């Protein structure tokens with residue numbers, strides 16, 4: 001669990017890395033529903049999640065294990081797939097970032 005949670009910090013650090021920035025940047029912070037004018041976002045997405053919130057939960061030792069960390073990462077992606085139409089550019093970006101996560105998560 002302790003070394004597992006250190007590995008999860010490594011995965012999140014890679015997701016924040018410069019080489020993935022072109023598709024990862026919309027996931028860096030909570031979706032700003034007000035600034036973006038997404039008036040129905042909170043109605044559709046009951047549990048918003050983003051990379052800064054996951055980073056804070058890891059630092060606060062809120063995750064019991066890798067499975068709990070992985071569930072929040074998958075929630076962030078699931079929210080994006082649920083809210084948006086399948087052809088939305090942000091959905092294409094979420095899948096590219098999910099490619100990064102799934103590889104690392106499966107090999108830990």
Ligand SMILES: CCS(=O)(=O)Nc1ccc(Oc2ccc(F)cc2F)c(-c2cn(C)c3c(=O)[nH]ccc23)c1
Pocket residue numbers: 025026027028029030031032033036079080083084089090093
């Ligand atoms: C850093 C968080 S922020 O809120 O500070 N910045 C920000 C700015 C633009 C955004 O939108 C797009 C981003 C890239 C595109 F290629 C198309 C977009 F429309 C979003 C955004 C993020 N997510 C998960 C969604 C989503 O799920 N649907 C709609 C919008 C968004 C967030």
